[PDB]
Amino acid sequence: LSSEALMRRAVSLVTDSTSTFLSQTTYALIEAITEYTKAVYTLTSLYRQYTSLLGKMNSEEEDEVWQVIIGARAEMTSKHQEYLKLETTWMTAVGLSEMAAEAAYQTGADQASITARNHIQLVKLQVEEVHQLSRKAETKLAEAQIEELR
Amino acid sequence: LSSEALMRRAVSLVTDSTSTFLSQTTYALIEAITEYTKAVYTLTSLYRQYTSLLGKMNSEEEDEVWQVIIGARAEMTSKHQEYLKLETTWMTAVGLSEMAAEAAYQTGADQASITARNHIQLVKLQVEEVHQLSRKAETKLAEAQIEELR
Amino acid sequence: NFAPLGTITSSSPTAQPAEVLLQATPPHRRARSAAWSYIFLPEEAWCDLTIHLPAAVLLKEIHIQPHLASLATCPSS
Amino acid sequence: NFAPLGTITSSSPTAQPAEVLLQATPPHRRARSAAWSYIFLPEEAWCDLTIHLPAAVLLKEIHIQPHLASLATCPSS
Known part of the structure; x- marks a missing residue:
């Protein structure tokens, strides 16, 4: 016999699950881009308040903003403790995707090879684009620094 | 997310790495069993060709057959040892899949669970049939070598 | 081992922080990037x-x- | 290059045949195994x-x- 029907209903369940997963990941990508932009803007806004507004106000607010800097730095480290695992999970995702591309090229499944190549390319584009928004904000911060210094 | 969810994500990273390793080992095992079976089949085909060319035995081809028989004894011991070691490695891979499935079931994936169950039953049938065919191949080779006396 | 208790530094001002080198746990075997x-x-x-x-x-x-x-x-050496 | 036109042999009888080394095209840049x-x-x-x-x-x-x-x-050399 041929296992084509077995593969057919297996991948039918897989495609239903991954269509639900694709809608869920569209929603979760909206959530993730929102959270990532909020975190980057929080970092840059606290840097801006650290650099731009020292000495204009009185002494009590000076001590207040200093304690705010200390506490917010601690809380930002605590919140950013989640981002260290994102790099490693993207590392393992990239490795697994490259393995899938190689294995599908080896087996010869053209649809699976295209799926794995576009999988690594798409995860690369998504992670590099959220990181690209972050580094665009960082580059804007550096440009504002070099223009403010000179 | 939570502490249990953080543990889930950490074990997801670990199990994705070990599942990359497990996929590599399992594909290597499948290819090794394929080479096993194809080497046995090629040796049997060469022996059948020599038997089909009977009557015109010469020094060159009979010396080749003697070398084939010596290498066939060496191959018998090597095939037995590598069958033992491949069964042991398949048991290790099954244990790795077992712990990966435990992690996934503690995660809560059900479509993955049913797909894995269907894959397990299908590959159980397939490996049972192919391993029975292989063991029968070496059993017939050993019987032919034994009855070569008469 | 006494590396974890120590502090590492380099004479090159552009060198990355090397404190990751003193931990007892080595990184992944085929990590795309070296630890330092x-x-x-x-x-x-x-x-x-x-x-x-x-x-x-x-x-x-x-x-x-x-x-x-x-x-x-x-x-090299 | 004249490697493809030649035949490569090794002194040790147990050596795996190395005719794959003479392919005119290089193997994969990050191949997971060695050709020979x-x-x-x-x-x-x-x-x-x-x-x-x-x-x-x-x-x-x-x-x-x-x-x-x-x-x-x-x-090594």
Whole structure:
């Protein structure tokens, strides 16, 4: 016999699950881009308040903003403790995707090879684009620094 | 997310790495069993060709057959040892899949669970049939070598 | 081992922080990037890592592990 | 390049055949396995590889590409 029907209903369940997963990941990508932009803007806004507004106000607010800097730095480290695992999970995702591309090229499944190549390319584009928004904000911060210094 | 969810994500990273390793080992095992079976089949085909060319035995081809028989004894011991070691490695891979499935079931994936169950039953049938065919191949080779006396 | 208790520093101002090198746990076997990387200037031949310890110890052996993924980046000497 | 036109043989009888080394196209840049592998016996220190050409050739250069994935297996000399 041929296992084509077995593969057919297996991948039918897989495609239903991954269509639900694709809608869920569209929603979760909206959530993730929102959270990532909020975190980057929080970092840059606290840097801006650290650099731009020292000495204009009185002494009590000076001590207040200093304690705010200390506490917010601690809380930002605590919140950013989640981002260290994102790099490693993207590392393992990239490795697994490259393995899938190689294995599908080896087996010869053209649809699976295209799926794995576009999988690594798409995860690369998504992670590099959220990181690209972050580094665009960082580059804007550096440009504002070099223009403010000179 | 939570502490249990953080543990889930950490074990997801670990199990994705070990599942990359497990996929590599399992594909290597499948290819090794394929080479096993194809080497046995090629040796049997060469022996059948020599038997089909009977009557015109010469020094060159009979010396080749003697070398084939010596290498066939060496191959018998090597095939037995590598069958033992491949069964042991398949048991290790099954244990790795077992712990990966435990992690996934503690995660809560059900479509993955049913797909894995269907894959397990299908590959159980397939490996049972192919391993029975292989063991029968070496059993017939050993019987032919034994009855070569008469 | 006394590396974790020490503080590592380099004489190259552009060198990355090397405190990751003193941990007891090595990184992933085929990590795409090494734990610590140094960029050599075209004229520079030697880079130095100076580990400082809190107190004098009877040193016996030094172990250095390169990046097993790419041995091409292993130091020559 | 005259490597494809030649036949490569090794002195050790147990050596795996190395005709794959003469392919005119290089293998994958990050291939997960080496095209040709030799296993050294404990008493052995030198490996042998002889390339025979159909006719005399004014040889100028020899290029050897080690298995770049794991450079620890690159020949010492």
